[PDB]
């Protein structure tokens, strides 16, 4: 006679073993996999399947007033300048106009809040240095202010005039530059910047495409949606800046 | 490629932020200093550190333990300091070598071990309170404290809960670099090869999972750094192209996907699971299973290979064959 | 079929090879040249596995084991039933793993994002090559590889480790273990933190980046930051295999005694000997 | 620090189990040469004359051989145990039958041991058998002996450092570690398993579920037994210069049959053979050797696996004199 034996040669272990897969599959399929559907669902074309797969909308009580509740239905009835390359269901779309300006493909932005991202206090989070005057480029890093911006065509495009700092974390998120010969200032995310000792190289877009970088509303603050629009613009460059960038690398 | 993912090209400095808690804002001590090199891959600011009651208690108990170990170790090389620094790794405070069951063993045989055990338990608990309440004080969920509980439990299991269940202190983990490592094998050997304990597998499954997940999740966020994917809270409360592109990556690759919030739940779960699984296995071992290998043989899962060198009969059960 | 927001991203382009030819989806799945080659390899592989398992002694998923050839065969081709299947299946898994990684690249290109994922995926693929190719090459025989079998591969790990008396003392292993542990812990904290901030509960208010950092500064004096934890994560986890590979590649080709003994360089410095 | 490739590998288990030896050609060759200094057997002198049990005064054990034969054995006995010291090492140069010097009484005790080994423990030594050389390797004191406490260096033909000297207290853990392949196993496998036969090696349960009445509290073997067996297996492994896969398929240390190599059985008999060697022959000699040869508790020096194997799986790589000196075994 042994410890952990149960009638008809089942042992405690063997049970706990089934119990464990049960617990794991519950949590995976019933809980986690449902949570995964709090965004983007339900798919675009009231069947049984679709009620079963979502969870009960949770509600976020926002820090600076309001609520957001997910999942919720969010129809993208923004215009899309895309035509189809073929008949079949799985075929790709493609831009009819200027993808970068039309905001399609790798160049698309989300319908984020037309709001300004705030600090724990209220002041706008992403502000240029001319406002956040108590913030500095740190002890011994390149100060890009004044340096030329050089686009993918190796042609000069503008001049860096300001850095925009996230105030909540202490982190620089964009450079603000001046589009040479357009009487306009443009933002570029530091992700797209090779920051040298004597210049800033950007390979996302060609120089003369700096012209059309989405413009901000106020000039000393930026909206969550504007941040996407801007980020998205340069991203679009990777694939669209020339006819050859959409093609195959090898 | 986005250099910003590799290191931070241009650091920024500003006044140090403080978020006010519901208590002990007065216990934060320290002169928050910065660090250029730390800033290239992290946040430059170090400190200030929050004290608090529980935090101090942890250090009290913790060092009592460390002292009790370190002293038994210095004793083990007869208090000669040069040998102690040389043989460090090999030195240990061990549990009772003889079978005293659940009775308090003599100091010369696992008495001190049981002592340091207790103080480390005390230390661990204290530190939990700190981890727990800090979340409370700042108005945050207690996910971290719950997860950390799993880890502490597992330590209690291999520490004393198991020894208790089989009723012998000899079964606990020795304090010491090599000695605690040796235990792993003495324990696996004793219970019939841990490769064959299913919970060992579950725990390993999840631990590799965390490897897979963090590797994947982290890579994902960096790949969408250009859209501020890093700004996770707001991507949660206001989905943006960053997590849209993240999601569509995975969806186009593996056929499904998560949400910037949900993934952290996967992550959190997998972590939690490593310790829960570990604990479940240890609980069963000795109590309800004696040889994990034979147990898998009993349920017909263990594989078998043909002989290569000739098979070799236990000579101990030959006719003839001495003691 | 598409996610609420997916339609706009579904443009043509990004491929490494082929162009428009395989540039399309099938369900949620992106195909591409490498999705095609990937499928071809997965099909051969699972076939070879399934078919070779059938000359096996059992159908129990836990006991099925398909093993490499005997040492004597060296680096040459082995008869199917004596590790030939194993060799084929190994070539298939490598073709698949690579297709899969290259495919992920095309996907990141269409999406205009970082290649950080396929890149990180090279770590796991690399370590697999260390185990089934590089070390085997260094010791002169495919026979040194691990067998394909749910439990049986553990048997190999077991024996491989005891071939060195106590694999725990392998310094490359000590490293790798520690990364494994710490990474699992980091994923706990990071995943936990975000959740602790978006989900304070009681219908309290969602908190701030400031709160994130505040939390750790308090508990341990430091806080690495949001974009930073993500990098640290990729690093910790990648190192499980990046350092571990040395411990593996070293056992045999560069060291033939128990690992404990290797610590003689320390224990036996004549100074304190 | 890091031995360069290639490495000689052998296969001891079914393909795909990573069972087998892993060897450094350099280190093998070095031992092959140290082990090659086994003196060749003397040319054979034919059987003529009368049994020496009358022709000599004090010949207890070897009394069946002619004087032609008996002298040849004494020539070999000399090469093996003291080729430096001549015959006069055990004898008096005039009084050859004199048990004057103690190496005489002992060498006899050894003669029976050798003969017992090659006759009874053929399950271990088989066709190879031992001679005085196997252990002595050209010196009265064999290089690898053990006392009732761990000692260093393992080869006594080297000068101990201060900390190696058994009197140094702080040097303990390291004397212990080096007996156990450098592990930190707080156990001395020799006194525990090899001196006598008090302890049982096996520690793993033979059934899948815990047997009632030996699985709870004060009725259980402590976990420490497992540690200690692990120590013996470290030690043994090192003594033959081999790894666990030489004998075990790690999938289950506890199982024989297909899970064990034939060398595992051989090793099993070896453990018994050592216990006999030690308890009945070597340990008693403490009442016949200089107090200087004894240990810190008057123990005579004794044998572990190393004593014969000295780092090789078969001692002297299998070299045998069994046919050349049949007076040593097996006794017909
Ligand atoms: C050097 C040491 C190694 C090791 C040591 C090891 C241990 C010690 C253990 C495992 C375990 C596991 N290993 Mg093994 N392993 C496995 C696969 C696996 C799983 C059977 C299981 C859980 C792993 C997991 O959850 O990861 C995280 C990934 C997750 C959670 C995503 C899901 C992946 C899915 C679970 C894996 C699917 C495996 C398929 C059954 C096999 C492939 C199917 C074929 C038909 C295509 C693969 C595919 C490989 C490859 C390709 O190299 C591999 C290599 C290795 N393992 C190394 C040789 N592994 C555990 C086990 O219980 O095995 C029985 C266990 O304890
Ligand atoms: C030959 C013996 C072996 C063995 C023996 C073994 C045992 C006996 C156990 C494991 C366990 C586990 N093993 Mg296994 N193992 C594992 C992986 C795993 C882990 C996933 C898992 C959990 C242990 C852990 O995470 O501790 C790390 C985490 C810990 C220790 C929690 C500590 C957190 C703590 C709260 C923090 C406190 C720190 C304080 C600051 C310290 C201060 C103290 C001061 C005051 C003194 C792998 C991948 C392999 C491979 C690839 O071979 C393997 C092979 C082996 N294991 C061999 C088969 N292993 C455990 C398990 O799950 O069994 C089912 C277990 O019990
Ligand atoms: C007695 C023998 C032991 C042993 C033997 C051992 C060896 C021999 C090795 C390790 C190694 C390692 N061990 Mg160790 N070990 C470890 C942990 C670790 C791992 C971190 C590490 C590398 C794992 C690996 O090789 O993944 C490999 C996994 C891979 C390559 C996965 C491949 C991914 C692939 C590209 C994708 C898979 C595709 C799927 C088929 C897809 C399936 C389709 C489905 C899912 C849709 C722990 C925590 C412990 C504990 C707690 O005791 C332990 C004890 C032991 N190990 C024992 C002492 N261990 C390795 C190491 O680095 O040592 C230094 C190694 O070689
Ligand atoms: C899969 C999920 C896992 C997981 C989970 C989690 N793990 C957590 C948490 C969660 C969630 C936390 O929330 C908590 C934490 O804090 O996160 C920041 C924590 C913890 N994980 C630690 C270590 C760890 N986790 C391991 C394992 C896993 N964890 C697994 C993998 C391992 C392994 C495996 O080895 C290790 C070693 C610590 C960092 C921390 C405990 C602090 C403590 O308990 O301190 C104890 C108290 C002490 C005082 C000890 C410190 C003493 C020093 C030497 C100071 C004394 C010297 C003094 C200054 C000199 C005085 C001089 C004077 C005379 C003038
Ligand atoms: C250090 C960093 C690590 C890391 C990181 C990352 N990990 C990734 C990625 C990244 C970044 C991806 O991007 C990619 C992915 O998309 O994720 C969702 C992926 C993936 N990680 C898998 C398994 C996995 N990761 C492990 C470990 C780590 N992950 C470490 C920790 C481990 C173990 C055991 O440790 C496992 C088992 C798959 C789920 C998936 C491959 C899909 C595939 O490859 O499709 C193509 C191939 C198949 C679908 C099956 C192959 C069919 C072949 C021909 C026949 C099979 C033969 C096989 C050899 C037999 C196995 C025997 C077995 C019993 C022993
Ligand atoms: C006869 C035979 C067998 C051969 C046929 C083979 C066969 C299957 C072919 C099918 C033919 C088809 C349909 C056509 C071809 C189309 C094609 C190329 C598709 C290939 C199909 C295929 C092989 C599918 C397999 C997919 C597969 C490898 C899935 C494995 C998934 C697993 C287990 C991974 C574990 C990772 C894991 C735990 C993730 C859970 C959470 C997730 C989803 C994290 C991902 C994720 C992370 C990590 C974020 O950080 C994140 C951040 C912000 C937003 C979102 C996310 C996010 O989604
Ligand atoms: C092992 C140490 C040892 C050495 C070396 C040794 N002897 Fe002996 N000798 C003995 C022992 C022991 C005996 C007892 C034989 C017996 O009891 O069977 C013995 C017996 C003898 C006897 C018989 C004594 C008698 O008359 O009763 C002779 C003669 C002899 N040895 C000659 C030699 C010669 C010649 C050599 C050198 C070639 C030699 N011995 C070297 C130990 C030794
Ligand atoms: C199984 C290993 C082994 C074998 C085989 C062996 N010896 Fe010994 N011998 C020992 C040990 C152990 C001692 C005790 C330690 C010591 O005194 O050196 C010893 C002691 C001796 C001594 C005394 C050494 C001294 O100066 O204190 C002599 C002489 C001797 N043996 C002769 C022989 C002869 C002759 C043979 C062949 C019959 C032989 N030995 C075979 C292991 C062995
Ligand atoms: C030289 C052959 C040999 C080698 C090498 C060897 N073993 Fe053993 N092992 C044996 C024999 C024989 C026994 C049985 C002893 C007995 O029962 O008297 C045994 C017993 C064991 C046991 C006890 C199993 C039970 O039935 O309770 C374990 C565990 C073990 N060995 C592990 C190891 C480890 C770990 C190593 C590597 C450090 C190793 N062995 C190397 C021959 C060997
Ligand atoms: C009396 C000297 C002596 C002692 C002591 C000794 N051995 Fe042996 N060993 C031998 C001889 C002689 C052989 C014969 C080798 C052969 O068969 O070719 C051998 C063979 C072996 C073999 C078989 C090697 C092979 O490749 O087949 C193993 C395994 C072994 N010994 C293990 C041990 C272990 C374990 C111990 C300690 C318990 C030990 N030996 C102690 C003399 C000894
Ligand atoms: C009735 C009462 C008295 C009995 C019950 C008391 C009780 C609950 C006992 C249980 C005790 C427990 C849980 C013991 C568990 C101990 C365990 C798991 C120890 C495991 C590993 C310990 C190790 C590796 C410690 C090594 C220590 C040293 C090298 C010296 C200490 C110095 C350090 C810097 C600590 C290392 C910290 C690390 C980050 C490197
Ligand atoms: C969400 O972002 C995170 C941080 O910054 C805000 C951290 O400091 C930390 C903790 C930092 C260290 C060094 C443990 C974690 C785990 C994290 O996830
Ligand atoms: C051994 C550890 C267990 C980990 C479980 C692995 C989780 C993978 C979940 C995939 C879910 C598949 N799907 C699309 C149906 O959700
Ligand atoms: Fe994250």
Curated annotation (Swiss-Prot), chain A:
Any single GO CC term annotated in Swiss-Prot or TrEMBL for this entry: plasma membrane light-harvesting complex
Role: The reaction center is a membrane-bound complex that mediates the initial photochemical event in the electron transfer process of photosynthesis.
Name recorded for this polypeptide: Reaction center protein H chain
Membrane protein topology class: Single-pass membrane protein
Cofactor note: Binds 4 bacteriochlorophylls per trimer.
Primary location recorded for the protein, binned into one broad class: membrane
Cytoplasmic domain ranges by topology: 31-250
Periplasmic face of the membrane: 1-11
Signal peptide bounds: none
Organism this protein belongs to: Blastochloris viridis
GO biological process entries: photosynthesis, light reaction
Any one Gene Ontology molecular-function term assigned to this protein's record: bacteriochlorophyll binding
Any single Pfam family the record assigns to this protein: PRC
Obligatory cofactor(s): a bacteriochlorophyll; a bacteriopheophytin; Fe cation; Mg(2+)
Membrane spanning residue stretches: 12-30
Family label: Belongs to the reaction center PuhA family.
Subcellular location: Cellular chromatophore membrane
InterPro entries in UniProt: Bac_photo_RC_H_C (IPR014747), Photo_RC_H (IPR005652), Photo_RC_H_N (IPR015810), Photo_RC_H_N_sf (IPR037097), PRC-brl_dom (IPR027275), PRC_barrel-like_sf (IPR011033)
Residues where N-formylmethionine is found: 1
Subunit comment: Heterotrimer composed of subunits L, M, and H.
Domain of life: Bacteria
UniProt keywords, alphabetically: Bacteriochlorophyll, Chlorophyll, Chromophore, Electron transport, Formylation, Membrane, Photosynthesis, Reaction center, Transmembrane, Transmembrane helix, Transport
From Swiss-Prot, chain B:
A single GO molecular function term of this UniProt record: electron transporter, transferring electrons within the cyclic electron transport pathway of photosynthesis activity
Alphabetical UniProt keywords: Bacteriochlorophyll, Chlorophyll, Chromophore, Electron transport, Iron, Magnesium, Membrane, Metal-binding, Photosynthesis, Reaction center, Transmembrane, Transmembrane helix, Transport
GO cellular component: plasma membrane light-harvesting complex; plasma membrane-derived chromatophore membrane
InterPro entries: Photo_II_D1/D2_sf, Photo_RC_L/M, Photo_RC_L/M_CS, Photo_RC_M
UniProt-annotated binding residues for (7R,8Z)-bacteriochlorophyll b: 180, 200
Tree of life domain: Bacteria
Subcellular location per the Swiss-Prot or TrEMBL entry: Cellular chromatophore membrane
BP-aspect Gene Ontology terms: photosynthetic electron transport in photosystem II
Membrane-spanning ranges: 51-75, 110-136, 142-165, 197-222, 259-283
Its membrane topology: Multi-pass membrane protein
Main location: membrane
Ranges per topology, Cytoplasmic: 1-50, 137-141, 223-258
Matches recorded under Gene3D superfamilies: Photosystem II protein D1-like
Binding sites annotated in the UniProt record for Fe cation: 217, 232, 264
CDD domains: Photo-RC_M
Binding partners and assembly: Reaction center is composed of four bacteriochlorophylls, two bacteriopheophytins, two ubiquinones, one iron, and three highly hydrophobic polypeptide chains (designated L, M, and H).
Protein's job: The reaction center is a membrane-bound complex that mediates the initial photochemical event in the electron transfer process of photosynthesis.
Family: Belongs to the reaction center PufL/M/PsbA/D family.
Descriptive protein name: Reaction center protein M chain
Species per Swiss-Prot/TrEMBL record: Blastochloris viridis (Rhodopseudomonas viridis)
The organism's taxonomic lineage, starting at the top: Bacteria, Pseudomonadati, Pseudomonadota, Alphaproteobacteria, Hyphomicrobiales
UniProtKB/Swiss-Prot annotation, chain C:
Record bears the keyword Metal-binding: yes
Cellular localisation: Cellular chromatophore membrane
GO cellular component: plasma membrane light-harvesting complex; plasma membrane-derived chromatophore membrane
Pfam families xref list: Photo_RC
PROSITE patterns on file: REACTION_CENTER
Keywords, ordered alphabetically: Bacteriochlorophyll, Chlorophyll, Chromophore, Electron transport, Iron, Magnesium, Membrane, Metal-binding, Photosynthesis, Reaction center, Transmembrane, Transmembrane helix, Transport
Coiled-coil region(s): none
GO biological process, one term: photosynthetic electron transport in photosystem II
Record InterPro entries: Photo_II_D1/D2_sf, Photo_RC_L, Photo_RC_L/M, Photo_RC_L/M_CS
Binding residues annotated for Fe cation, in chain numbering: 190, 230
Residues the record lists as binding a ubiquinone: 216
Lipid bilayer topology: Multi-pass membrane protein
Residues that bind (7R,8Z)-bacteriochlorophyll b: 153, 173
Cytoplasmic membrane side: 1-31, 111-114, 198-224
Periplasmic side: 53-82, 139-169, 249-273
Transmembrane domains' residue ranges: 32-52, 83-110, 115-138, 170-197, 225-248
Complex formation: Reaction center is composed of four bacteriochlorophylls, two bacteriopheophytins, two ubiquinones, one iron, and three highly hydrophobic polypeptide chains (designated L, M, and H).
Family assignment from sequence similarity: Belongs to the reaction center PufL/M/PsbA/D family.
Entries under NCBIfam families matching the protein: pufL
Its biological purpose: The reaction center is a membrane-bound complex that mediates the initial photochemical event in the electron transfer process of photosynthesis.
Protein name: Reaction center protein L chain
UniProt lineage: Bacteria, Pseudomonadati, Pseudomonadota, Alphaproteobacteria, Hyphomicrobiales
Gene name, Swiss-Prot/TrEMBL: pufL
UniProtKB/Swiss-Prot annotation, chain D:
GO cellular component, one term: plasma membrane light-harvesting complex
Biological process terms in GO annotation: photosynthesis; photosynthesis, light reaction
Binding site for heme 2: 110, 132, 135-136
Post-translational modification: Binds 4 heme groups per subunit. After the signal sequence is removed, the N-terminal cysteine is modified to form a diacylglyceride thioether, but the alpha-amino group is free and is not N-palmitoylated.
Keywords: Electron transport, Heme, Iron, Lipoprotein, Membrane, Metal-binding, Photosynthesis, Reaction center, Signal, Transport
Effect in UniProt of substituting residue 264 to K: 110 mV decrease in redox potential of heme 3
PROSITE patterns: MULTIHEME_CYTC, PROKAR_LIPOPROTEIN
Molecular function as annotated in GO: electron transfer activity; heme binding; iron ion binding
Principal location listed in the UniProt entry: membrane
Protein's cellular compartments: Cellular chromatophore membrane
Residues anchoring lipid (S-diacylglycerol cysteine): 1
Binding annotation for heme 1: 74, 87, 90-91
Observed effect of gene inactivation: Lack of photosynthesis.
Protein residues bound to heme 4: 124, 305, 308-309
Record's bilayer topology term: Lipid-anchor
Quaternary structure note: Component of the photosynthetic reaction center composed of protein subunits L (PufL), M (PufM), H (PuhA) and cytochrome C (PufC).
Name by which UniProt lists this protein: Photosynthetic reaction center cytochrome c subunit
Species for this entry: Blastochloris viridis (Rhodopseudomonas viridis)
Lineage, top ranks: Bacteria, Pseudomonadati, Pseudomonadota, Alphaproteobacteria, Hyphomicrobiales
